[PDB]
Amino acid sequence: TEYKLVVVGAGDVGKSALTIQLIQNHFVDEYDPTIEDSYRKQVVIDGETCLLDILDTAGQEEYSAMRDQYMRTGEGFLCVFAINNTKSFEDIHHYREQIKRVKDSEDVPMVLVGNKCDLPSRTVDTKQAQDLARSYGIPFIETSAKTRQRVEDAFYTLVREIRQYRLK
Amino acid sequence: TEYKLVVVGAGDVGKSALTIQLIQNHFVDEYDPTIEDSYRKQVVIDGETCLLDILDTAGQEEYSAMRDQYMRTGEGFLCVFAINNTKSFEDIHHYREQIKRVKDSEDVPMVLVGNKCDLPSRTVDTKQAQDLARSYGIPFIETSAKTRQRVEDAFYTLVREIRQYRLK
Ligand SMILES: Nc1nc2c(ncn2[C@@H]2O[C@H](COP(=O)(O)OP(=O)(O)O)[C@@H](O)[C@H]2O)c(=O)[nH]1
Ligand SMILES: Nc1nc2c(ncn2[C@@H]2O[C@H](COP(=O)(O)OP(=O)(O)O)[C@@H](O)[C@H]2O)c(=O)[nH]1
Ligand code: NA
Ligand code: NA
């Protein structure tokens, strides 16, 4: 039932920062007196209960056995790069292709995110990213976790993509 | 083929500290000229290629959709508590029971670890832990990631447990 979001992308692009910001304003204390302590947190986005996972192959998942399992379990993917990191943008295709392979489908809920849009030191232009998103058939959003710009929007977009996919 | 180790336990018991220490002295640069860049890191413990994963339900996996998948993929479990944290010891049974349930088996390679054995502020006695390990049928090891005591031993023990299990 819950929407399973997975944030993917190169290391140091702001996956953790984005997810923490989102959770900060979206967690609810859910009351259930038939469980220990009675109050578990859950994340609710655009009126949907969401589960959230970060696939971090640069850090926490470098020596991991779980990469393909994150991709099989995940329902929608936020593919993140940083606007000051050309390599992180170049890495998007590899992640996208992986997910496509694992899920064995051309149609996966995905949103492309260019993070750190507050930085003056841009090397990835909006148009480059737009072209990429358009090739994939997916939305593109620029975000900044530092300044809190379009963070909720990116997650909201992905939720909506998953909602549309589920209606098929 | 590779040994899939999963470190489980309450938050702040030293799972990350233990795993980082282990990796520090066990990673090898593996040369393979048919791949990009030619040199991927791998972890080798007791002459076995290992993959390493931390299940952290207090942090990185609190809102996660992946708990049961970590347990299904994992082959051996390092169950960690801290000797100054009574609650973290009380939580071991819950983790153990979860893994048993997910894997549908009484026989899972497991090692019980009491971490932070360098601390003077003990509330879990060695005998308590020994009794627990003995009930489970598994080794118990006290460790300190801070002072670097028995860290390799704990992982070596779990590797050996997995080796024995695989020989069945
Ligand atoms: N200027 C700026 N820095 C950011 C932004 N998001 C994250 N960072 C920083 O980038 C680094 C990597 O962030 P982190 O969330 O750890 O990236 P992850 O490795 O992809 O999870 C940290 O220093 C963050 O503070 C952002 O939108 N703008
Ligand atoms: N004294 C002491 N502190 C430790 C030890 N291992 C970890 N810590 C500290 O305990 C805290 C939690 O460690 P961390 O690895 O983040 O725990 P995790 O949440 O289980 O991954 C940090 O402040 C670590 O530095 C240890 O063996 N001894
Ligand atoms: Na790493
Ligand atoms: Na958390």
Residue numbers in the entry:
A (entry chain A), B (entry chain A): 2 to 169
What sentences appear in the manuscript?
KRAS belongs to a family of small GTPases that act as binary switches upstream of several signalling cascades, controlling proliferation and survival of cells. Mutations in KRAS drive oncogenesis, especially in pancreatic, lung, and colorectal cancers (CRC). Upon activation by upstream growth factor receptors, RAS undergoes exchange of guanosine 5ʹ diphosphate (GDP) for guanosine triphosphate (GTP) with the help of a guanine nucleotide exchange factor (GEF) such as son of sevenless 1 (SOS1). With the help of GTPase-activating protein (GAP), GTP is hydrolysed to GDP thereby desensitizing the signalling cascades.
To understand what structural transformations that are plausible for G13D in vivo, the first objective of the present study was to investigate if Mg2+-free G13D can exist as a fully open state, P-loop exposing conformer. For X-ray crystallographic- and ELISA studies, we produced G13D KRAS4A (2–169) lacking the initiator methionine (iMet) in magnesium free buffer, with the intention to create a Mg2+-free fully open state G13D conformer. We present a fully open, P-loop exposing conformer of KRAS G13D by X-ray crystallography at 1.4–2.4 Å resolution in Mg2+-free phosphate and malonate buffers. The malonate crystals diffracted to 1.4 Å resolution in all directions (isotropic) and the phosphate crystals to 2.0/2.4 Å in best/worst direction (anisotropic). The G13D conformer has the switch-I region displaced in an upright position leaving the catalytic core fully exposed. We believe that G13D has a high probability for having a fully open form by electrostatically repelling the negatively charged switch-I loop that closes over the nucleotide and codon 13 aspartate. In this open-state conformation, the P-loop-located region is exposed and should be accessible for binding mAbs, peptides, or small molecules. The main finding in this study is that G13D exists in a fully open state with the switch-I region being fully retracted leaving the P-loop area exposed and druggable.
